Design a protein around this nucleic acid. Structure first.
Ligand code: DJJ
Ligand code: DC
Ligand code: CL
Ligand code: CL
Ligand code: CL
Ligand code: MG
Ligand code: MG
Ligand code: NA
Ligand code: NA
Ligand code: NA
Length: 326
DNA sequence: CCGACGTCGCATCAGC
DNA sequence: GCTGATGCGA
DNA sequence: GTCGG
């Protein structure tokens, strides 16, 4: 990491703006600049050099100059001193506690892990599970464990219905040596953009994974998206593995390529690519790519028979999953 | 100088 | 209940 | 906070 000091600074500023300021566009701007700087293949020597990169403007350039000269950023040194900002930033590290809930908890005197555990009463279901596994959810998953988890998920899915196809996406599909959680794209021929011919398609996979004690908790669940918790089995006398976040997304089978493009990410890559689509006159979601008429209303879905077809429409050279870790 | 910034699923709540 | 908005998340 | 028209 040539520029890790700068990128950490911008990331901390991004998180400040999201959690404390509740300024989602500043959050995205800071993360976009951190990402372009992270892939820049030179050790940055000045703010002016960084300002050449798209997403780095005047203000970030000045912060880079202060950071290069001093090793620090006074704006951040002060944010770290604000008790309210410290409290809010801590509380939002619990899954299910966002910017608004964190600020309300602080108002109510609930500011520390101690306070949260004393007040499970005041937590919704999601937050209660985020608190239960607070430590575990900050541990990363070695790719070796991702492979064991993939084996279980793919085999249990096959036992329910051999026509399911489960694909592990996220950073795993991008070839990362570790991942923050497990993301699973699911398809079944009974669920297409034209009809849903079988109910409970997601539910049946979730129940089977619960049956074998792989899924341990549910954060939210609907007809096409599961957000929950899972755990690898341990051997005799072994310490248990940490509990891990798992997301399962059921996507219409004929829309698999848009779905796997979405779920492979990264999230910044998707934002960048979707914004480029818009400048090229297209809109992309996890289901389709459609043209945008001058009216601004999306037209009919365009034929897609590969991930690369999506890149072709917007005049981008193809980028393998490994090259999408923005 | 300023409007737009990616797109959408599930949980929650307010008004009717 | 339904609908629409907001929060939080992918 | 940055960018493009
Ligand atoms: N705001 C977002 C968040 C996620 N996503 C997509 C892209 C992302 O790759 C996918 C899974 O989300 P996750 O937060 O798990 O991101 P990952 O790419 O898997 C890595 Cl941050 P990690 O989960 O391995 O740490 O969902 C998105 O489009 N927009
Ligand atoms: N989860 C998945 C994965 C692949 N597929 C289909 C889409 C393609 O037509 C086909 C090609 O397989 P693969 O992409 O794994 O090479 O598999 C699916 O329907 N659901
Ligand atoms: Cl903002
Ligand atoms: Cl600092
Ligand atoms: Cl669509
Ligand atoms: Mg992930
Ligand atoms: Mg723009
Ligand atoms: Na720039
Ligand atoms: Na949180
Ligand atoms: Na995830």
């Amino acid at each position: 990491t040539l520029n890790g000091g700068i990128t950490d600074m911008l990331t901390e500023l991004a998180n400040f703006e999201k959690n404390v300021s509740q300024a989602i566009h500043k959050y995205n701007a800071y993360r976009k600049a951190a990402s372009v700087i992270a892939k820049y293949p030179h050790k940055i020597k000045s703010g002016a050099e960084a300002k050449k990169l798209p997403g780095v403007g005047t203000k970030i350039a000045e912060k880079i100059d202060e950071f290069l000269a001093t090793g620090k950023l006074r704006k951040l040194e002060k944010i770290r001193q604000d008790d309210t900002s410290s409290s809010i930033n801590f509380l939002t590290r619990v899954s299910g506690i966002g910017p608004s809930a964190a600020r309300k908890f602080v108002d109510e005197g609930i500011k520390t892990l101690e306070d949260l555990r004393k007040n499970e009463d005041k937590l919704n279901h999601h937050q209660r599970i985020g608190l239960k596994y607070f430590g575990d959810f900050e541990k990363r998953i070695p790719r070796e464990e991702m492979l064991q988890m993939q084996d279980i998920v793919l085999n249990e899915v096959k036992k329910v219905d051999s026509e399911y196809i489960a694909t592990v996406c996220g950073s795993f599909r991008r070839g990362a040596e570790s991942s923050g959680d497990m993301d699973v794209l699911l398809t079944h021929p009974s669920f297409t953009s034209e009809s849903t011919k079988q109910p409970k398609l997601l539910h049946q996979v979730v129940e089977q994974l619960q049956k074998v004690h792989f899924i341990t908790d549910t954060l939210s669940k609907g007809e096409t998206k599961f957000m929950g918790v899972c755990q690898l089995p341990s051997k005799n006398d072994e310490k248990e593995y940490p509990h891990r976040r798992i997301d399962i997304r059921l996507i219409p089978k004929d829309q698999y390529y848009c779905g796997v493009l979405y779920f492979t990410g990264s999230d910044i890559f998707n934002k960048n690519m979707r914004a480029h689509a818009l400048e090229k006159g297209f809109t992309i979601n996890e289901y389709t790519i459609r043209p945008l008429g001058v009216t601004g209303v999306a037209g009919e879905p365009l034929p897609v028979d590969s991930e690369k077809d999506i890149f072709d429409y917007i005049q981008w050279k193809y980028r393998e999953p490994k090259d999408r870790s923005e």
